[PDB]
Amino acid sequence: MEAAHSKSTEECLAYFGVSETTGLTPDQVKRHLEKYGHNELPAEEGKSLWELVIEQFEDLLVRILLLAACISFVLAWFEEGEETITAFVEPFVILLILIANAIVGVWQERNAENAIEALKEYEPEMGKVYRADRKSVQRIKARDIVPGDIVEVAVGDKVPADIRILSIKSTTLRVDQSILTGESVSVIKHTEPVPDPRAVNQDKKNMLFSGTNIAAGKALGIVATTGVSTEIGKIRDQMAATEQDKTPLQQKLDEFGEQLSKVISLICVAVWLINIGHFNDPVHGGSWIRGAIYYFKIAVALAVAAIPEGLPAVITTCLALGTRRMAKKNAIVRSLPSVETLGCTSVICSDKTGTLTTNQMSVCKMFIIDKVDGDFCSLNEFSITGSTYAPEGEVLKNDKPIRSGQFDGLVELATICALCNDSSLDFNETKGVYEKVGEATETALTTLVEKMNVFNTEVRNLSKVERANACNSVIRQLMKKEFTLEFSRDRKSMSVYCSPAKSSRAAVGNKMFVKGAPEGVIDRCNYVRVGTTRVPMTGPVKEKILSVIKEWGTGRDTLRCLALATRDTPPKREEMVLDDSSRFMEYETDLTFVGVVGMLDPPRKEVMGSIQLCRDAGIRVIMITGDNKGTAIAICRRIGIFGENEEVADRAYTGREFDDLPLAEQREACRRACCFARVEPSHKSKIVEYLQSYDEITAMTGDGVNDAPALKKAEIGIAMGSGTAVAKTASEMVLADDNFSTIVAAVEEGRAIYNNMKQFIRYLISSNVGEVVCIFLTAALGLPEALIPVQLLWVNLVTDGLPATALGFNPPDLDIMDRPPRSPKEPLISGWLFFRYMAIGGYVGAATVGAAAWWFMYAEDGPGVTYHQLTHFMQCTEDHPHFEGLDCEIFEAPEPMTMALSVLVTIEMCNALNSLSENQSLMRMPPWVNIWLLGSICLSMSLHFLILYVDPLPMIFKLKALDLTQWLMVLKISLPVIGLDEILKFIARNYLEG
Numbered sequence: 001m002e003a004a005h006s007k008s009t010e011e012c013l014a015y016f017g018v019s020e021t022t023g024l025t026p027d028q029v030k031r032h033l034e035k036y037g038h039n040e041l042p043a044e045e046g047k048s049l050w051e052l053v054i055e056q057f058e059d060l061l062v063r064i065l066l067l068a069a070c071i072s073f074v075l076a077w078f079e080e081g082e083e084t085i086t087a088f089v090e091p092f093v094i095l096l097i098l099i100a101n102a103i104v105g106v107w108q109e110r111n112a113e114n115a116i117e118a119l120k121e122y123e124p125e126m127g128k129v130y131r132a133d134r135k136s137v138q139r140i141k142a143r144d145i146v147p148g149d150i151v152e153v154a155v156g157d158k159v160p161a162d163i164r165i166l167s168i169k170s171t172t173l174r175v176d177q178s179i180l181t182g183e184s185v186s187v188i189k190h191t192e193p194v195p196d197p198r199a200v201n202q203d204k205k206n207m208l209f210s211g212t213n214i215a216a217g218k219a220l221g222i223v224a225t226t227g228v229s230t231e232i233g234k235i236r237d238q239m240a241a242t243e244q245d246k247t248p249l250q251q252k253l254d255e256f257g258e259q260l261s262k263v264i265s266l267i268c269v270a271v272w273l274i275n276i277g278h279f280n281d282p283v284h285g286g287s288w289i290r291g292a293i294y295y296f297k298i299a300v301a302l303a304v305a306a307i308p309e310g311l312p313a314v315i316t317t318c319l320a321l322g323t324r325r326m327a328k329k330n331a332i333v334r335s336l337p338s339v340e341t342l343g344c345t346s347v348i349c350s351d352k353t354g355t356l357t358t359n360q361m362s363v364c365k366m367f368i369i370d371k372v373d374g375d376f377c378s379l380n381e382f383s384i385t386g387s388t389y390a391p392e393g394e395v396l397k398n399d400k401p402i403r404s405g406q407f408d409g410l411v412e413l414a415t416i417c418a419l420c421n422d423s424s425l426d427f428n429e430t431k432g433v434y435e436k437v438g439e440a441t442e443t444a445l446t447t448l449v450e451k452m453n454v455f456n457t458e459v460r461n462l463s464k465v466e467r468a469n470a471c472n473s474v475i476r477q478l479m480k481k482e483f484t485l486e487f488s489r490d491r492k493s494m495s496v497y498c499s500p501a502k503s504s505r506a507a508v509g510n511k512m513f514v515k516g517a518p519e520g521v522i523d524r525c526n527y528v529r530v531g532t533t534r535v536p537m538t539g540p541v542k543e544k545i546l547s548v549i550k551e552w553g554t555g556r557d558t559l560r561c562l563a564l565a566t567r568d569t570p571p572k573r574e575e576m577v578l579d580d581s582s583r584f585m586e587y588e589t590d591l592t593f594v595g596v597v598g599m600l601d602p603p604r605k606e607v608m609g610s611i612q613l614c615r616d617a618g619i620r621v622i623m624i625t626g627d628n629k630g631t632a633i634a635i636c637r638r639i640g641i642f643g644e645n646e647e648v649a650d651r652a653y654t655g656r657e658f659d660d661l662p663l664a665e666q667r668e669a670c671r672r673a674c675c676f677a678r679v680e681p682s683h684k685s686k687i688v689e690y691l692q693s694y695d696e697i698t699a700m701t702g703d704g705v706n707d708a709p710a711l712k713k714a715e716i717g718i719a720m721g722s723g724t725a726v727a728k729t730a731s732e733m734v735l736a737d738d739n740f741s742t743i744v745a746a747v748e749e750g751r752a753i754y755n756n757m758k759q760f761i762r763y764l765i766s767s768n769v770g771e772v773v774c775i776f777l778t779a780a781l782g783l784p785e786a787l788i789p790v791q792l793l794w795v796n797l798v799t800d801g802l803p804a805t806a807l808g809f810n811p812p813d814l815d816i817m818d819r820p821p822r823s824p825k826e827p828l829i830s831g832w833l834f835f836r837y838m839a840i841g842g843y844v845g846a847a848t849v850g851a852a853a854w855w856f857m858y859a860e861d862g863p864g865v866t867y868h869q870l871t872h873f874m875q876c877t878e879d880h881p882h883f884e885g886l887d888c889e890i891f892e893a894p895e896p897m898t899m900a901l902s903v904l905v906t907i908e909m910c911n912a913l914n915s916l917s918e919n920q921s922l923m924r925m926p927p928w929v930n931i932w933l934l935g936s937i938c939l940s941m942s943l944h945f946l947i948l949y950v951d952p953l954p955m956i957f958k959l960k961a962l963d964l965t966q967w968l969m970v971l972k973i974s975l976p977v978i979g980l981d982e983i984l985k986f987i988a989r990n991y992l993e994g
């Protein structure tokens with residue numbers, strides 16, 4: 001029964017065919033269990049370990065490498081030689097990487113927590129029902145509760161289902177439902193129907209929501225909904241239905257993988273097409289088996305040359321480091337891939353209170369009526385010093401301090417403030433500062449009366465914790481609080497009914513003290529207090545009051561105004577129905593206006609500067625707040641969201657206004673809007689959708705379970721450090737200090753991380769372009785393998801991995817927060833840069849192939865076969881060039897491969913330096929700008945020498961230490977890559993203007 005709140009208790013009992021005093025029968029339980037299922041959120045996705053291991057082999061590139069491993073394993077199993085210890089190295093290395101890659105992926109899932117599973121925190125093991133088969137209450141498992149059950153709840157209990165309250169067995173029922181409504185204080189509940197079928201949860205005063213806590217009292221109720229049908233269950237279903245897109249980098253990486261495999265196959269086809277002259281070779285003679293091994297051998301090297309095998313690790317290492325850096329600036333990143341998305345943020349939607357503002361509410365202005373004489377009117381207007389919940393401060397008139405007790409109108413002002421109040425003030429002994437106990441609005445009133453001190457009580461004699469409630473206590477002893485009529489959003493006021501403490505069984509003396517939004521309160525005032533006297537409320541007086549309120553609430557003061565009033569002659573105590581909140585407005589009529597208080601929740605000292613940074617970065621900021629629209633707009637102006645004088649009619653909306661717009665107008669509103677006042681949880685989600693249909697990258701704040709759908713849907717969900725665990729698990733980022741400025745500082749940091757990522761991605765991939773050319777060249781010219789997979793793997797994992805990681809520490813550009821948000825669709829490599837890395841790739845390929853071939857021919861140590869071709873033959877069954885003696889295994893010597901590798905390694909150290917800046921010359925941006933990079937290059941070279949000298953390694957990698965002369969040739973062919981890129985950088989700067 002989803003519309004339970006609007007049904008009478010009788011109607012709820014009759015719908016389920018159940019009696020309040022007996023509860024459901026065994027047959028009813030069985031039938032209701034079949035119909036509605038168990039009272040629980042559905043179980044998590046059954047993701048087994050085996051299924052998880054398989055998923056690690058789904059990526060296109062890892063499939064290629066597994067196929068590479070399989071061919072490599074077959075070529076080791078059917079090879080020529082006796083060394084099994086060296087033959088099975090290549091396949092085993094590739095397999096280890098696949099296994100290591102699988103271990104990490106599997107590990108990441110075991111430590112991952114999901115938000116849907118964090119909801120189960122809010123479903124208790126047990127509940128209490130009355131069922132027909134037993135007289136006394138029976139505690140059962142919450143999952144066995146069905147709609148229709150008569151349920152009992154008491155103080156401390158966690159509500160087991162969405163329940164319609166039937167009867168409250170205590171004076172009052174109080175409920176902590178902050179997790180669902182963001183209501184600070186525990187809320188009061190009643191049993192009367194709530195007419196609106198579309199009432200938001202806050203107006204459902206006759207409902208208990210699954211997962212909330214009873215703060216005070218004991219109630220009997222009937223279960224309306226269970227399982228996915230509850231308020232928390234609906235939140236769950238929304239989250240489960242939210243699919244999150246891959247980040248722009250992940251999408252480009254996948255695009256790259258698709259293209260890479262397409263290119264790998266086409267090269268294989270080219271290598272086959274370039275060797276179709278083998279069809280003209282005689283069938284008798286020649287080695288088919290060795291020529292087939294040669295083709296597969298280069299297919300493996302091709303596959304290994306093409307994949308940036310060390311790229312995922314570099315990305316992760318870079319992400320982890322920047323993440324720990326962001327943590328020190330209070331930005332706790334939960335999703336490593338989100339750092340990129342964060343840099344792309346184009347819209348930040350931010351809650352106001354605690355994030356834009358300090359949530360330290362303070363009264364700094366108030367007024368009472370001074371005089372009423374026909375058309376003429378005057379006010380006694382005061383100011384109050386002090387921005388803390390601390391009683392430290394004084395009341396001023398015209399900037400000079402006055403005694404508050406000197407004005408009778410202020411005495412009642414304080415009385416109303418002290419009594420019409422569900423909050424208190426306490427000094428936290430450990431923290432060293434004063435902390436609010438309840439609603440911020442109310443605690444600010446508590447602080448006000450301590451500053452006022454209307455009866456001049458000695459406060460200097462007491463300590464911090466003791467004087468915190470000194471002036472309040474004086475007023476409480478003066479009037480007895482009979483009851484309280486709780487605040488309601490419809491009438492926008494609250495009141496207390498008070499009787500004199502001095503009197504006994506009297507007939508007269510009672511007062512209602514009333515507080516609320518000025519509008520409704522003032523309209524229900526028939527009288528105006530002037531000192532101790534009373535005059536009728538008249539037009540000129542009303543104008544004057546509203547005029548000041550309008551100025552305080554909509555002008556530069558940006559104050560929340562509250563009107564204080566008294567019912568001098570309240571209805572007889574027995575004539576009041578305390579269970580029917582719909583009668584509460586009627587009880588608060590024929591009031592006497594006493595005064596207005598205006599309170600400021602000040603902006604964080606850093607937000608105004610941070611909003612400016614957003615403007616400079618082309619990031620739109622949207623404020624979301626519970627202030628009324630006029631005050632919301634005033635605050636946006638104050639902090640820089642709106643200009644002081646600019647028109648904003650179509651750029652600020654309340655929930656009501658926004659709902660009255662048709663779908664098309666709602667979308668349009670979202671593209672220009674910067675202020676949303678009084679929206680519901682549902683609006684956050686709709687705002688994100690609309691922003692996403694303009695392709696905005698949206699950051700959205702949230703703190704409660706009700707925020708989880710929107711947090712999950714936004715590209716960057718941002719949770720408060722002080723908020724719920726559920727909100728945190730639904731988010732990409734957590735604000736440790738809750739500060740809006742932390743968001744902006746995280747966006748900047750994200751922009752800087754991405755820029756460095758782009759450099760090392762381009763660096764690693766460009767090397768793969770060069771390695772592929774080398775392999776293609778050797779396969780095209782029929783040369784012996786200049787580079788083998790084991791060597792290629794070492795270079796991509798270790799040798800280049802360090803300079804790649806070092807590039808992650810490139811200094812950031814000074815204009816970082818002065819450019820518009822990066823386009824999600826921006827390619828990493830295109831246009832001139834594509835040509836640049838083709839030219840470098842073409843150079844690297846030729847430089848490595850040339851270095852190996854040079855050793856074979858023009859070198860001193862080599863078997864000088866100058867202009868003789870290895871292209872000619874690798875057969876050794878003809879002996880044309882060698883005319884006497886047998887020697888052919890030099891075609892498989894370790895020296896020319898060492899030449900090729902040392903060239904690759906050296907060029908790549910040079911190309912890392914080329915990668916410090918995209919377009920700037922090493923003459924304008926020198927290598928020593930990144931000390932880490934210089935360090936990594938040294939470490940990489942010493943690791944290259946390590947695999948050349950340290951006994952086991954030289955054999956494994958098929959290498960042997962180069963001569964001093966041979967190292968000079970390496971430098972001769974490698975170093976000019978700097979020159980080449982320098983030239984290409986010169987062309988990009990001068991002949992390609994924007």
Ligand SMILES: C/C=C(/C)C(=O)O[C@H]1C(C)=C2[C@H]([C@@H]1OC(=O)CCCCCCC)[C@@](C)(OC(C)=O)C[C@H](OC(=O)CCC)[C@@]1(O)[C@H]2OC(=O)[C@@]1(C)O
Nearest residue numbers: 252255256259260263306768769772776828829834837838
């Ligand atoms: C890396 C190794 C190889 C063998 C492959 O060719 O890379 C291509 C490739 C997959 C792309 C291309 C490569 O194209 C070429 O190398 C030119 C074709 C000549 C083939 C040589 C035959 C002997 C990148 C590498 O070209 C250059 C010169 O840098 C740029 C870029 O890559 C990126 O933008 C980085 C993606 C994270 C991609 O065109 C990319 O595909 C698209 O999805 C992009 C948009 O991604």
Ligand SMILES: Nc1ncnc2c1ncn2[C@@H]1O[C@H](COP(=O)(O)OP(=O)(O)OP(=O)(O)O)[C@H]2OC3(O[C@H]21)C([N+](=O)[O-])=CC(=[N+]([O-])O)C=C3[N+](=O)[O-]
Nearest residue numbers: 182351352353441487489493494515516517625626627678
């Ligand atoms: N949709 C709405 N319709 C009508 N009024 C709304 C609405 N939403 C909020 N208000 C009023 O505005 C004040 C601020 O809203 P609130 O939601 O608590 O703050 P936030 O928006 O910052 O919440 P957040 O921190 O983001 O989770 C509340 O103070 C009070 O009644 C509330 C309040 N209260 O919530 O309990 C008590 C009170 N008295 O009487 O002291 C005065 C308020 N007031 O004057 O605004």
Ligand code: NA
Nearest residue numbers: 711712714717
């Ligand atoms: Na999200």
